[PDB]
Every structure is written in structure tokens, then in C-alpha cells.
Amino acid sequence: SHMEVNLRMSWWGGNGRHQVTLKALEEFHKQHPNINVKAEYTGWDGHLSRLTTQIAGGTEPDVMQTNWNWLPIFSKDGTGFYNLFSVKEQLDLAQFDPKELQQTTVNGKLNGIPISVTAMIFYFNDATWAKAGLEYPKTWDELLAAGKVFKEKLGDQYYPVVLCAGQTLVLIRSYMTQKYNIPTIDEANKKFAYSPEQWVEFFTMYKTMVDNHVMPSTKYYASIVKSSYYEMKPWINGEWAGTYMWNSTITKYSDNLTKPAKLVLGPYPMLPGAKDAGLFFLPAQMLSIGKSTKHPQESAMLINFLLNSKEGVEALGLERGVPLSATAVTQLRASGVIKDEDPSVAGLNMALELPHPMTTSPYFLDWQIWSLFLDAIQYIDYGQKTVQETAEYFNKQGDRILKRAMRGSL
């Protein structure tokens, strides 16, 4: 009878994402014949920018694929997207680990549901480590000891792992959490949480790692975020014999190794006595509801359909990663779409099974912070600043960036 509801939904992706999403939408309309969905989809380029102007003028879509770091952009207050807590009758929030939802909560307002989550963990070149005669490290000391075994037994060009600056940042953060159980960012005070001495310690650990031949210094490899190592010869040759990176995108990296060598999942190094592995779990992307939607219930039903319903989940498959949704996981395992023997999947499973009560701030992902960190480690590697001067430099310049980024609500 009469009355129907017209929703708009955006997302970005390649044609492969477009096809399954378009397919999922058709299934949704089948089961909700009075709700139509107009799809607004492009590639990544220009997408944020277009959405930015829509959000500003209150003409954004009812349902949006969003990135985690858009919370600092659109929703410093938590009010930049619709509060998903207000539509829990349409949205089955129990399917998503409460802890993961904390990270997408701002000021007690749920701003998105992680479609999928991924953690930064260790994967190793199995051949190379067999050449070294080493078991993969279960402790930081073992990782450190591995650097010198690689150096003298295999050669100066061999390293246990190769690391982007940003990956190193996350790695040492992980160590610091294990030790002190505080986050890197103090959100409420809008500055870094570590003490001066802890900053000295943070960078002392970097120096200790490089001195111990754990990874190439920045004179040999120097990239902020771009995982460009996988196309380079020492990776392919098995000289850079491992990586610390998102579990979700491991296959591309492993296939570029000289066979029969592949990437296998490593243990996660633990300090003795720790109660938190200090893992970085990233919502790879989220679904959010437009702040200004005239249809929050139907938008909520669409999100619920895409993440939780049988034919929504089936359509969408693994085209946005392993779902966070519990029912989605169980369903995709039964159909054999999720295999526990996939290095990518087993890694997620290990990360989930490890203790990780410390969450991570979206402001931690700021590109200026990550760039600054490459600057900082270069000061150390190139002898231009002592570890202690670098810690004070990073603390100071970091705080300036944070302060500027954490104020200024659009």
C-alpha cells in the first residue's frame, strides 16, 4: 500500500566491490519491497572530497561506507554521524564485539559499525628462518636475538623482518602497551600520554632494534606507510625475511616470494607479566548512517541486512574482508568461504584470542604523526640527533599536531 522509502547509499571500491554490493542491494529490496536503494558509488579518488561537501550541506546519503579516520574529520563530537545506539531495534548490535564498537564510539555515540577488522601482526619467510635455524620469536628478546643470528649466520644483508616507519611505530606502541597499559594518545587531554622518560624509552627500543639487526635502518629502507618492500629484490630473494602488517592483505605479499617459500603466521612477542598484547585493531571500513537522515530506521535495517542477514552476507562475501559480525563469520565458515588455514584468517583468529583490552585512538592514524615518526627515526639513524633529543622532538612536534587536529569541529 502507498508509502515507500527512498534511501541513498554510497561506497567506494573497484568494480568487483560494486558488483557484489549492487547484488546485495537487490536482495535487500526483495525482502523489503517498500524500501528502495539508490546506489552512489565511485573509486577512492574524489570520494572523500565529494562526500565532504555533502556532509557539510546536510545532503549526504542515508547509508555510507566510511573509514575509521573520518571520525576525526566529521565527528570530533560524536554527532557527525547518526547515533547507532538510537536504532538498536533495527540493528542487531550483539553480533559485533562490544570492544570493537568502543573504537567506533565517540562521546558515547556509536558512529559506525566496523564491516571488518584487521590487526597488525608478524608473518615470516619460512625458508629464510629455516636457513637461520630459528624458531619464530615468542618474546621481544628472542626477536632481538634473531637479528644477530641473521647477521652473522646468513649475512649482513639478511634481516628477521623489514619495516615501514609506520609499522615500526605500531610495533613499539604495542611493546609500550604491554609494559605500561596506557594508550599512546590521551584523548581527553588532547596530547600524547607517555611521560618524557617513556618517550626516551620508546626511541631507545627503536635504536636497540636497529643496532641488533632486527630490521634495516632507514638508510636502507625508508617508507612511511607504503608497503613497497614486496616488489623489491631482498623481499623476493628472502633477505628481508618477514613483515609486521595488517593480517588482511597478506596474500599479495606472500605470492611475491621465490617458491617454495611463503609467508607463515608468526607468534606475537610478549613481555613477561603482560596482560595486554597491545594489538592495533583497525576497522578496515565502517557503515555509518547520515546525521541528517529522514529515515534512520530503514537505514539501520539496510546496514543490518548487509552485515548480518543470510543473503546479505552471502552476496557480500569477503569483498571487504572477514566480517566482524559473529553470525556472518559462522555463516561464511559453513559455506567454506572462510578457511581457518588461510594465513590471513588464522592471523585474525590469533589476534582475537590474545588479550587486548587497550583500544587505539583514530587520531593515532594521523598522516602527520606517521611522517613525523619517519623524520624522528631518521634523525637517529643518520646521527643528527641523539635518542633523547629525538624523543623530546617527537613529543613536542607530536603534541603540536595532535592539539591542532583534536580541536576544530567542522
Binding site for Br ion (CB under 5 A): 43-44, 139-141, 183-185, 360-361, 364
Q: Are 224 and 231 in contact (CB under 8 A)?
A: no
Quote the DSSP letter at residue 121.
E
Please state the closest distance from residue 221 (CB atom) to Br ion, in A.
Answer: 24
Cβ proximity to Br ion: between 77 and 141 the closer is 141
165-180 vs 196-211: helix axis angle to the nearest 10? 120
CB closer to Br ion, 44 vs 382: 44
CB of 216 vs Br ion, minimal distance in Å: 22
Q: Which residue has the cell 606507510?
A: 225
What is the enclosing helix (H) or strand (E) of 8?
strand 5-12
Output 75 or 361, the one with its CB closest to Br ion: 361
Nearer to Br ion, 5 or 193 (CB): 193
Q: From CA 301, how far away is CA 148, in angstroms rounded?
A: 56
Nearest alpha carbon to residue 92 among 385, 344, 353, 304: 304
Name the residue nearer to Br ion (CB basis): 232 or 271.
271
Which of these, 319, 321, 312, lies nearest to 116 by C-alpha position? 321
CA distances from 67 to 74, 276, 400 (A): 11, 26, 24
**Cβ closer to Br ion: 44 or 220?**
44
Q: Is the four-CA dihedral 362, 368, 371, 376 of positive or negative sign?
A: negative
Dist. CA 158–CA 302, nearest whole Å = 51
Residue with cell 571488518: 116
Whether 248 and 283 have beta carbons less than 8 Å apart is answered as: no
